[PDB]
Symmetry: C4
Subunit: 136 residues, 4 copies
Amino acid sequence: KWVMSTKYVEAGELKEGSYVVIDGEPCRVVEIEKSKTGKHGSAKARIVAVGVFDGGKRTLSLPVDAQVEVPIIEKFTAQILSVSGDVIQLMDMRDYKTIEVPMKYVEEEAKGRLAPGAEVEVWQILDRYKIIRVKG
Amino acid sequence: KWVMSTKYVEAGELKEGSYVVIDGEPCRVVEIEKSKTGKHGSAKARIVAVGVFDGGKRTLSLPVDAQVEVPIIEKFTAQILSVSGDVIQLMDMRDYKTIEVPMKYVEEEAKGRLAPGAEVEVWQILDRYKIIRVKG
Amino acid sequence: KWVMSTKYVEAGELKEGSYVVIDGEPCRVVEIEKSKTGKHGSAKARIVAVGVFDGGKRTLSLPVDAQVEVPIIEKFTAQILSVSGDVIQLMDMRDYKTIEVPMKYVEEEAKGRLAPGAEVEVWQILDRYKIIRVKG
Amino acid sequence: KWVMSTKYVEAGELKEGSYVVIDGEPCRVVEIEKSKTGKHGSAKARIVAVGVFDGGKRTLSLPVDAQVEVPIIEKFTAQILSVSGDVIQLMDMRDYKTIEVPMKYVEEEAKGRLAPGAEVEVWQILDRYKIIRVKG
């Protein structure tokens, strides 16, 4: 079964705010450090990032010219249909279909304004969704 | 495979004591709050309920005219055949078949009078049973 | 797939030292209490037993004339081939085949004399074995 | 499905530093004790070893002439491609293929010098790999 073609960029091109996949988890880069120990060697990059879904800190150290996978992020608007303590039921405003998003995949800052009828900015990465903020 | 046709009611029709399904768990409603922030918008209902089987507190906030699933509850009488620390063996007085109910699915107030020979009120929701009280 | 024909006895026939199956676990009866609340009703028995394999306390309350399953226990002698912290390797002295028994299934009192070359009394219940004591 | 032919040696031939398999885990022998209780019996060996992969202490007591399985250890050199907090990506210098090794399978003393570009000594036992030290 196919899904998409993996997209890559050189590690040296990443910057704070960029998105990268580390050990299967799409992450947002929070810090990057460069170094060069080899007199005639390649520069290395040490990336620190945070998981978009599990919020876990991850690191990756590799040559600046080595490829790193970048997640494809689709952004769209949805309307909240209902809110339970565990799931947010949404109506995709693009095709009007109903999508369920776990409460754990809601940006902390947006949890406080979750209410039926409100519109939210949603991000889809592969088969998972994350509610970014209210309005959108 | 089919089982039953899901039954629904509008959220605004629920009352304390009503039964509803929230995230797959049939629950008894313990409190309902109504609100209306939109000048010309729909009123919203915030439901607080307790899981019939796991006893967990659950909440659901949605428009008063949105459909909410209501569990089908079949009530019947059974006779206790045996009682272990983990399972209550019962004889369904309708067809005389033997049914096993986990001790965790016995209302706390009824656990104290569980004894072989006693009759109990039993509730069946889908493929699970709950012992409500002794006698029935 | 068939295995054996379940053997039963009336609860009222059990005594301290008897073996019974409670919720799938073969247990040794440690105490039995009898009672009779119904003027013209059946006497009831409250059995307290201990799991042969998990060592857990279990109880069963039912009429004295109700059937209770009794495990089939096959006793034989085996020679210890090797002993690790987790498994005892044995040679069945009946057919000379090698059988492995988890350390958790060794009577506490026998663990202290487990040594290669020693003979032990082994009990087999269905597909599980328990080392009872050294010598046998 | 076949893999390899199990290799054995007599327990009495093992020495500190030897490798043995105890309950499915390849281990390095750290201590061996010999004894002989039977006037005309066989000498026994008590082996204490440490798991190559889980680092767990294991013991095995058996006759000195009893067979014990010895793991086949293939040693080779690899170059580190990248290092995350959970996985070390390596290039097998024999065929240039990429192999991923969990951080837990890296000798503690080598973890401190893990860096892209460094060469490491790698050990393969069946389908698992362990990074022994930097350089190799």
